[PDB]
Amino acid sequence: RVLDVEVYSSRSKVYVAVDGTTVLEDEAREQGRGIHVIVLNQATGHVMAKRVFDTYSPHEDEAMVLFLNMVAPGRVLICTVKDEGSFHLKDTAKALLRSLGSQAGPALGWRDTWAFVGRKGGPVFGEKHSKSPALSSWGDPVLLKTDVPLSSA
Ligand SMILES: O=[N+]([O-])c1ccc(O[C@H]2O[C@H](CO)[C@@H](O)[C@H](O)[C@@H]2O)cc1
């Protein structure tokens, strides 16, 4: 009746594991920058969608908004940042993250790390954030481990 979800966000590496199986892993240098998004079925944990939005670059946040608005309210939503996800995370995307209940997403800053697990229509199940301490530095790697409830009946 529960999914064991692990989410890792850092300068050079992201991964997501569900029930001990890696469903997303990107450790490639110079690739996969931005916010990675995984959508899971809320009864089985099966992956319904996997995306990466390079929100360090213009226009990617608009694509993230259009994608997230089509996710059904019951789904499990997982986000994790690789390298930099804030430079072009603009106000409409931040407001959408705030509407999910995210505390750190709407405040994401330069080279911060961020891992998030929650139900599309609320509530948030787990969230971790590390603020970069200097423009030349990154946030500390964050490893979020969250038990996500499953729907049934
Ligand atoms: O020449 N520039 O305008 C310029 C130089 C460096 C820069 O930041 C560096 O950090 C980014 C975010 O961490 C990385 O994604 C890039 O690989 C980049 O090398 C951004 C712009």
Question: SS3 letters for 33-93?
Answer: CEEEEEEECCCCCCEEEEEEECCCCCCHHHHHHHHHHCCCCCCEEEEEEECCCCCCCCHHH
Experimental technique of record? X-ray
Tell me how far CA of residue 53 lies from CA of 11, 38, 42, 58, 140, in angstroms.
Answer: 16, 11, 23, 10, 21
Taking the CA of residue 30 as reference, the ligand 1 atom at the shortest distance is 17
Cβ of residue 111 lying under 6 Å from some atom of ligand 1: yes
Cβ of residue 88 lying under 6 Å from some atom of ligand 1: no
Domains contained in the chain, number? 1
Taking the CA of residue 83 as reference, the ligand 1 atom at the shortest distance is 13
Question: What does this entry list as its resolution, in Å?
Answer: 1.4
16 burial via Cβ count (<10 Å: 0-12, 13-18, 19+): buried
Binding-site sequence positions for a carbohydrate: 33, 83, 111
Binding-site sequence positions: 33, 83, 111
Identify the domain containing residue 67 by its residue range. 1-153
Cβ of residue 83 lying under 6 Å from some atom of ligand 1: yes
